[PDB]
Amino acid sequence: MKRIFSLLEKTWLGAPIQFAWQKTSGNYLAVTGADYIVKIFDRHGQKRSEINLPGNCVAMDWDKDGDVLAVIAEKSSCIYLWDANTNKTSQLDNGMRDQMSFLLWSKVGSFLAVGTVKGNLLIYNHQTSRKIPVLGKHTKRITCGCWNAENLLALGGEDKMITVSNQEGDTIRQTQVRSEPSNMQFFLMKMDDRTSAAESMISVVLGKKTLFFLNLNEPDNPADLEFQQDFGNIVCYNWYGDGRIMIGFSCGHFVVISTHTGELGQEIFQARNHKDNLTSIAVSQTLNKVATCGDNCIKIQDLVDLKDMYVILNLDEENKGLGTLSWTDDGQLLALSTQRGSLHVFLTKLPILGDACSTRIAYLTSLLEVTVANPVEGELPITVSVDVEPNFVAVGLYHLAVGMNNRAWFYVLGENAVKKLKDMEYLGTVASICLHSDYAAALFEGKVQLHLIESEILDAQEERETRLFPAVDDKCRILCHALTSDFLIYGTDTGVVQYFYIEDWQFVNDYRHPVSVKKIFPDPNGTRLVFIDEKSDGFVYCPVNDATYEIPDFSPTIKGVLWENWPMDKGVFIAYDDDKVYTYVFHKDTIQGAKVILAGSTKVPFAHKPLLLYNGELTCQTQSGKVNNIYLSTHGFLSNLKDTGPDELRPMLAQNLMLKRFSDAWEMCRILNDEAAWNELARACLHHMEVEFAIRVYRRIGNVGIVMSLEQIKGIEDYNLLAGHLAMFTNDYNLAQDLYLASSCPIAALEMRRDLQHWDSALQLAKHLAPDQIPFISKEYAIQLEFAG
């Protein structure tokens, strides 16, 4: 949590203030104090508008959409209405002539309620401009009220009455209460039957000491809850979750109560968050958290477990006497007032915007700052101040881009400073942008524009400065794109994948999938691709042979994919969602052909977004704007290797042998000092045809006979002949025979079978390959048969 801005107007010093957040669209913040003005600010503390009043602001409220702010004032009959789409102020005379005492918009209906000191009511409709005066609704000042989802209006007054009404102001119900009503709210009791959706019940605080309940279906049986005097007076209460209330009390305590059938008023939880004074509570269902303020501090807790303190903020001694808390509905901002007349605004959540190019990453770190880093090379993080709140961010080798709607802004990532190059405006809303080398590719309206980030007239080609895809003028829409050191790549609604080669400035491959291609994710070089189709099925594509492979167990929840940037693990990638990362390996070369294998899954902490994979370490952006690193479960062998010994080294060795990392596997076998590990390394060197390394390993094992035999074969360049001899050394005689028959020297199969004394197979081979050897083979077989009887 970080303080964005503070309001400290000289006109408000020494008096309390009131404020309101634009509700459903939290872009504006209305504020007022003893200067008879309402001032409207903008999430950045800059004043956009002001409303002048003939006296103190009595109340203010925003409409259901945040399009209109309503205000009422002392010594006035006019409501003041301010419009967020025009920034204009207008007036509405209440048609009574009394001082107003209450003001509230409906949650659903464009209605505005207005109560008076004499207990009269007005209901206004902003959409039809209809006024509905109702005289004598209360006998004294209307103090409080609430609107329900059915446009029913409940009102409390100093006459110790509660009244419930339709949107036309008619009285549905009237009730008398033991003390003056305050903090009136509507709710729904969650009965076991799913069939009721009407919020049939009212909660209210009486005399600042008891919480009272009125049920519109059972009005003959209201409930009073009384609380321990050691808590002090009730300061505030809020509804949260399924059927719970949280109540804050003056002596630093808060309590949570059940409202389930048979448990109404049962205490679920209690805490003394503050020692001397608790001044306000504010609950966000959007973050699932609560903020509390008291003793010159803010204390924030998780609604999943109220014991778990998320944040404590301590405020400087100038801020003595805390006032009121409120959040934006999106839970992006928290605001706090003081009794001395200051306002403070804090960031509660940051938009999770970030990107990567090779080992270099960019991520949002404040609403107007992007940080670029290279955690692999150890380059110091570079902070870029940006001219707009971005909707998208992209990074290259030498550049950063950010943008909003149909515009982007470009920056050079120099060693000494960051310099803004240019802003650029596209023909429609940019869905995404990608950078590589000093090219950028931007997607808008189903078309991709490739263009240079930097250029000059010196040897320029006008066709290279920019190009627009599909450049063949196909009827297809591009749904996704990616950019590499050498290729622009994109996928379409017609299911086409295309590669465009930047150096020649031409198309180089084209593949057609049976359904639309929704997303694409290339390796760092572009030589392989992951794509996701319209069914959310994942596929590897290999443009070099034009082949495709289905990714097994690929969850439809997967949001994205990252390839491993570590130079040995080029076939490794990950796919991810909000809860998990899945590690996949493309085995290009195996006896069973090419395939994709799920190597395992790693759990991801809440709202972390993956940016970079390097050597089984996953760098993620957090909601705080910071990065964090997660080791994959599939890479748990990477450790201080000597303490586990074989227990982490054996899976490391198996992984390294599959990755062909024989120099590492030798050092691991040296640390292991196990004859079985040396034999597994030797067998792997033979399977992977690494004869020079197999010679070294067998020389360490001391198997001189295998070393001499491998030294004889070392010069063989025929793949099938060499593989035949190595299969013979691994005792796989059937594979050895097939490979020798496919080789330049089929006779080696006959010789092998003769040497193994497999005389029937040797004779069958001799019939096809060397009929002149049949008599000699038959004599040697006959000698063996004569001995056998």
Number of other CB atoms surrounding residue 473 within 10 Å: 6
Q: Is the peptide bond before 567 cis (omega within 30 degrees of 0)?
A: no
Task: Spell out a b/e string for 381-393, using b for 16 or more CB atoms within 10 Å of the CB, else e.
Answer: ebebebeeebebb
Dihedral sign for Cα atoms in the order 552, 557, 559, 564: negative
Alpha carbons 557 and 299: distance in angstroms, whole number: 35
In Å, how far are 237, 301, 331, 349, 552 from 283, measured between CA atoms?
10, 10, 10, 15, 43
DSSP-based three-state secondary structure for 680: helix
Instruction: Give the whole-angstrom CA distance, residue 524 versus residue 433.
Output: 17
State in Å, rounded, how far the first CA of the chain is from the last one. 93
- What's the CA gap between 584 and 196, in Å, rounded? 48
Q: Exposed, middle or buried by CB within 10 Å (0-12, 13-18, 19+), for 38?
A: buried
Distances from the Cα of 592 to the Cα of 193, 426, 587, 596, angstroms = 57, 49, 10, 12
The string of DSSP letters for 193-256 reads STT--S--EEEEEETTTEEEEEESS-TTS-EEEE--GGG-SEEEEEEETTTEEEEEETTSEEEE
Report d(CA 502, CA 523) in Å as an integer: 16
Sheet holding 244-249, edge to edge: 234-240, 244-249, 253-258, 267-272
498 token code pair: 């295309």
Breaks (C-N over 2.5 A) in the chain follow: none
Q: Looking at residue 25, what DSSP letter applies?
A: S
The 3-class SS string of 602-626 reads EECCCCCEEEEEECCEEEEECCCCC
Task: Spell 319-347 as b/e; 16+ CB within 10 A means b.
Answer: beebbbbbbbbbbbbbbbbbbbbbbbbbb
Residue with tokens 């605001």: 335
Only one residue has tokens 């050597």, namely: 615
d(CA 144, CA 253): 24
Q: What gap in Å lies between CA 303 and CA 256, rounded to an integer? A: 11
Give Cβ neighbours of residue 608 (< 8 Å, ≥ 6 apart). 620, 621, 622, 628, 630
In whole angstroms, give the CA distance from residue 347 to residue 335. Answer: 9
Helices (H) and strands (E) in the chain, counts: 11, 59
Residue with the two structure tokens 């405020």? 315
Q: How far apart are CA 520 and CA 496, in angstroms?
A: 11
Structure tokens at 125: 């409709």
The packing angle between helices 646-658 and 662-672, to 10°, is 160
- DSSP, collapsed to helix, strand or coil, labels residue 461 as coil
Q: Are 277 and 309 in contact (CB under 8 A)?
A: no
Which residues touch 106 (CB under 8 Å, ≥6 apart)?
Answer: 64, 112, 113, 147, 151, 153, 167
State the sign of the Cα–Cα–Cα–Cα dihedral 759, 762, 764, 770: negative
Q: Which is it for strands 617-621 and 201-206: parallel, antiparallel or unpaired?
A: unpaired
Residue 391, CB half-sphere, CA atoms under 13 Å: how many?
Answer: 11
Amino acid code (one letter) for 449: Q
Q: Which amino acid is at 331?
A: G
Burial of 567 from C-beta contacts in 10 A (0-12 / 13-18 / 19+): exposed
Q: What is d(CA 552, CA 539) in angstroms, rounded to the nearest whole number?
A: 9
- 89 C-beta neighbours (distance < 10 Å), count: 16
Distance (Å, whole) CA 266 – CA 257: 5
For residue 604, give the nearest of 644, 626, 633, 563 by alpha carbon.
633
The CA distances from residue 37 to 48, 53, 367, 724, in Å, are 13, 6, 29, 92
Give the integer Cα–Cα distance in Å for 253 and 305: 17
